[PDB]
Design a protein around this nucleic acid. Structure first.
Ligand code: CA
Ligand code: CA
Ligand code: CA
Ligand code: CA
Ligand code: ZN
Ligand code: ZN
Ligand code: ZN
Ligand code: ZN
Lengths: 478, 478
DNA sequence: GGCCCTAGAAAGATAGTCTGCGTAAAATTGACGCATG
DNA sequence: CATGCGTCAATTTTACGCAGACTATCTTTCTAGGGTTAAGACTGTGC
DNA sequence: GCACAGTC
DNA sequence: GGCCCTAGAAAGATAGTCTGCGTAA
DNA sequence: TTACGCAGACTATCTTTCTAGGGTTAAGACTGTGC
DNA sequence: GCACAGTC
């Protein structure tokens, strides 16, 4: 059935359309509506001004563009009051002011507060639920997974208050929001996923290991693909349940040594030499264990990947070798995210989810992009370049309108005019001059607060001056 | 004797000098001459050019300036081939090119290769050692310690080859060079420290826990201070043997539950109600244990002469309260370092040590600086501004000389000219005479038929002129 | 609502700076005729 | 042609009122992040 | 029949 | 060198561009 | 009063190693209790 | 008188 982006999004060769595939217009439109609803409350009558207006689609895309660049650079835990510090960079200030950015980041909302009282008792995830579901839906519809899938967990660090955040001791960040997800091995496309949501998890009888494998697998349950799992999800009853009609999937993964189903023959005695392995069968399933170290034993379960052999080049059972090759399907995605991620400090947990969705979209967008382009036969650029182009495609239309203000400073105006593509169908000069070519109004060496107009410029440095200081040439020129 | 900078570094209000106190000429001179020795071995006749040149002190300081800014901007990754990408920023570009930076950093050496081969069987740390000892020496000499000191260890991440590389679980970074360290409490000034250097460390009878506390505390050995330390070091024989003619220091810290030092009355945790505590006296010193949780007990040792009882505001024994306040003296230093660290990927372990020394010099310089400024009675700026000022003080002389080349591009010339604080005219205080009095009264460039009043005096020749002929400057002046 | 601890960033507000435009007083400054040589 | 005096309404240069948009910097609240006596949630076995 | 200690 | 895996930066080298001074048309 | 060589510094981009970083069967090195 | 398994 092949692997790759589906027919619907196949002939796309640029980073913005590949991004819109995951976000869509419905998500951006919902963000704009609810954000405005919130902004309208946080506007006491002292706040009338440019920085405290409302939002639209162009601004939200530009905002995302800033988050995309934030991920490219490592400035994601850097103060916003430094990011927008001119002289270090004109990259962020050219899109919007630091105050507009701060106001908006505090006001983005993904839901309708008026209906919370009928949702919150049943769904602790309410404030991000509509967006999450639309997002995951897009992910599934844009791509056809290959032969092997990997299921594992991802933690979005977040130490603020959150009803379902949980501690995990062995992670880089230990106290955030747990998300379970499925990715295809070898490509790292995120296919599916869902929040853990604490102690809700209303499974019925089914333990969580099995429950989540069966739910995450839903899109692909009608055909045969493999599943690589952790020991949190791998078990004997799951290996057998997945082979019943409603699922055609099979499973490979390690198991815990304390499970009841493992025979004593595969347990670690001290008479068993180091480096040996043994196989036994539980019917259709093959259970294998081996001891790489004098006091350590590892167990693996493999269902449809049947038969048994040892790879003489390493001495390892072939089943573990297979496992080692597919087990990285989900953590590789996380590794790509930690290298290029935009996740900022915040005291509102639904933002943790929004930042996570932006990072996932950037990876999935890249995968589709890369695939479509290499299929066409053109060279594919790295993620770093994809992201730089994504930045411009998301912010250019906003910067273009920002320029309409007759009073948009000068240095902002000059930088925007030389950042934009200038993809104008037929633009040309009339007399070698730029289409704006305006002189500054005020005197270079005078305080701006006095608004003293400059009627002349310095021949030797082309600066605007007032007669009180100079007329033909400036005092700084000589 | 109080706490604070010593007599020699008592009145420094300039950040650059505060930095130089921990490097001095001996470290810079050794680095630059050994680096030149290395550069000459990396040349090929085909490489003759401006990039592959010998270093000098100004470049080395500028180079450290880049590393200081690197820490401010968190550019500890970020390929240098991106950091020096004009249009994102000119902050590094204006100091040196990316290829000069890559060549220079690659060639830095802190030692003499012709001597090393006869030193290496005795000291595995040879390639760093000379600089290291100079560095620590200055760290000890400046800044008198306070009444509370803390001893713990820090790990310099490094996964490359290193003979004494250590793996430590439960860390931010699993592998690296372990540094034993002593820091002042309250003010996190790094006083002393030393590499672990492998299992070959030779001690005589004394365990390492005990050994390191005695060596780290040497410079304060004859004064009474209260050392707070981890359970890797805390023990009865350490506590008993630090209150003798030599060594007059006390120890406070947690202990392991398996030491046969702890009586069975404390080593219980079964009949004891949760939240209660018990303690006893062994002699000069005391041991307390308490049971914060129904399945967990903690033991603490104090060799201070005290019975501090229980703090009623929490119910915790006062020894615990004390411990919690001073235990953070070393890890807080590591936290400050990781928030603004200058470190880069490298395959040469001595660089890991150099990067470590840069971060410590930056924090210790800040502490001396902060102290002197608040003592004077002036406001102290945060570390972020301190680092920005340090950057300019280290890179300015270099940039000033870089401008000497007639061919130093145009954008480099302009970005450098507008960042240098002293790029000013030799401006006078006043001007004795310009209009003079009434020399002509008519324009000397005007016909007798016009009799135009001369409304101006030539700026550079004081001639009687009409603005039409001589705008401000005369035609004979320019 | 959520283990001890810290440094420093977001949360949230207030006072100030950099750009454009328009009009009216102020600011000249460029001819205007009366002499000398 | 080179100078000289005292006159004016053209010219130009301020002064500042009509704002709009963006920015530096302050205090207070509270996450990000090191650290271990310290944090969840799960499965499967002893009393 | 409970609540008890071992791993993500 | 010294667990499994990957993605992407640093090693390390090559070919090319932006800048002024001396040549005159 | 505008073009061309010549030499000096800086710049983009390529391919081959091999560390930063994510895991979990996996990584040290010290201290005190098993035969 | 030797070899093993618990915490940074
Ligand atoms: Ca702000
Ligand atoms: Ca896992
Ligand atoms: Ca390079
Ligand atoms: Ca410690
Ligand atoms: Zn002026
Ligand atoms: Zn000028
Ligand atoms: Zn004239
Ligand atoms: Zn003149």
């Amino acid at each position: 059935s092949q692997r790759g982006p589906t027919r619907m999004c196949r002939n796309i060769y640029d980073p913005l359309l590949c991004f819109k595939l995951f976000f869509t217009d419905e998500i951006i439109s919902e963000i704009v509506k609810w954000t405005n609803a919130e902004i309208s409350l946080k506007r006491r009558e002292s706040m009338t001004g440019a920085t405290f207006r409302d939002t639209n689609e162009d601004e939200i895309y530009a905002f995302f563009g800033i988050l995309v660049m934030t991920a490219v650079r490592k400035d994601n835990h850097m103060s916003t009051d430094d990011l927008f510090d001119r002289s270090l960079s004109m990259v962020y200030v050219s899109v919007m002011s630091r105050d507009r950015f701060d106001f908006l980041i505090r006001c983005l909302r993904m839901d309708d507060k008026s209906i919370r009282p009928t949702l919150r008792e049943n769904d602790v995830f309410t404030p991000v639920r509509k967006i999450w579901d639309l997002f995951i839906h897009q992910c599934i519809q844009n791509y056809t997974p290959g032969a092997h899938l990997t299921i594992d967990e991802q933690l979005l660090g977040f130490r603020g208050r959150c009803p379902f955040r949980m501690y995990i001791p062995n992670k880089p960040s230990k106290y955030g929001i747990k998300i379970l997800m499925m990715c295809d091995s070898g490509t790292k496309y995120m296919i599916n996923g869902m929040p853990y949501l604490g102690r809700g998890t209303q499974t019925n009888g089914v333990p969580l290991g099995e429950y989540y494998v069966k739910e995450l697998s839903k899109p692909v349950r009608g055909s045969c693909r493999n599943i690589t799992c952790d020991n949190w999800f791998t078990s004997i009853p799951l290996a057998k349940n997945l082979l019943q009609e409603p699922y055609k999937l099979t499973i490979v993964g390690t198991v815990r040594s304390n499970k009841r189903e493992i025979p004593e023959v595969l347990k670690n005695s001290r008479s068993r030499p180091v480096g040996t392995s043994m196989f036994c069968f539980d019917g259709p399933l093959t259970l294998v264990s081996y001891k790489p170290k004098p006091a350590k034993m590892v167990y693996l379960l493999s269902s449809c990947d049947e038969d048994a052999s040892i790879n003489e080049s390493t001495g390892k059972p072939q089943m573990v070798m297979y496992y080692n090759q597919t087990k990285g399907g989900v953590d590789t995605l996380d590794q790509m995210c930690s290298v290029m991620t935009c996740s900022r400090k915040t005291n509102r947990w639904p933002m943790a989810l929004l930042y996570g969705m932006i990072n996932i979209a950037c990876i999935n967008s890249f995968i589709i992009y890369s695939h479509n382009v290499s299929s066409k036969g053109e060279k594919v650029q790295s993620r770093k370049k994809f992201m730089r182009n994504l930045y411009m495609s998301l912010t250019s239309s906003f910067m273009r309108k920002r320029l309409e203000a007759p009073t948009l400073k000068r240095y902002l105006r000059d930088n925007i005019s030389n950042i934009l593509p200038n993809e104008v169908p037929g633009t040309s000069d009339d007399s070698t001059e730029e289409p704006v070519t305006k002189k500054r109004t005020y005197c270079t060496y005078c305080p701006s607060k006095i608004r003293r107009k400059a009627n002349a410029s310095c021949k030797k440095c082309k600066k605007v001056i007032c007669r009180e200081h100079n007329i033909d040439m400036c005092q700084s020129c000589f």
